[PDB]
Structure formats: structure tokens, C-alpha cells
Design a protein around this ligand. Sequence first.
Ligand SMILES: *C/C=C(\C)c1ccc(-c2ccc(N(C)C)cc2)s1
Length: 133
Amino acid sequence: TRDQNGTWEMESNENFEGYMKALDIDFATRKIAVRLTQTLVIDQDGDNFKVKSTSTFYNYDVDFTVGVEFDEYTKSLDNRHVKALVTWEGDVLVCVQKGEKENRGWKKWIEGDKLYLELTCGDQVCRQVFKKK
Ligand SMILES: *C/C=C(\C)c1ccc(-c2ccc(N(C)C)cc2)s1
């Protein structure tokens, strides 16, 4: 399946530290962030996505259209400008963020009753598994 709608609660988080470090997020933010359960709210209508992740102390909001390039100012994260593009490979959703960092982006897919998120930056791979609320 390609359907990723829902409110998703984090079950496991393998190597989040490794990924955040590759982005140059400040240590103080990293230490707090690795302990926190995330609630991911995905609103997917055709090719239009509105994604909100929230925790006790941090917000992450982004709106995008699949197959349409867009200029991003990553305000709350690392404060950079990137040219972003999101597409499909079989049943895997693939984002490439073109800019300074290499291999920057992510992949999301389903196997059984879980959502896999693979976040990449450089030579690091973070694997997160979520289950539906
Ligand atoms: C496709 C889903 C993506 C890219 C994300 C979901 C949560 C994200 C996130 C949460 C929190 C932080 N910090 C720095 C607290 C960064 C990213 S990205």
C-alpha cells in the first residue's frame, strides 16, 4: 500500500542521534529530542500533503505537493534553503532535498501494520517504526 494517512505514534527509533548530528542541529536540542515520543499527523489528499509532527517542546510543519519542486526555508530545524522534491518507487515514498548536504532526504513505507521511516543524511541511516494510534 501507498496509503500513509493517520495519527501515528512512535514505537522504535534506531539511530536518530546519528541523523541529527549529520544536519548540525545543536547538541542541546538533540539531547532533549532523542528521548521524546513523537506524534505524527499526516493529511494526504491526492498529491497534497500537510505534515505536522509535535512533541512536548518542538514543532515541525511542512506543506508539499508530490512531483512539484518547492523552495524550503527550514526555519526551526537547521535554517537552510533547499530545493525539495517528493516521488514514488513501487510502494516507497522518496524525498530528495537538493542542497549542501549529500544523500539528504527520506523514505516512508508500510509492511503489515507498521509505518517505516528511513531518514538519511550523509552516510547515516535512522530507522523509525510507528504504529497507528
Ligand atoms: C516525512 C516525515 C518527516 C520528514 C519528519 C517527521 C518528523 C520530523 C522531525 C521531528 C523533530 C525534529 N526536531 C529537530 C525536533 C526534526 C524533524 S521530520
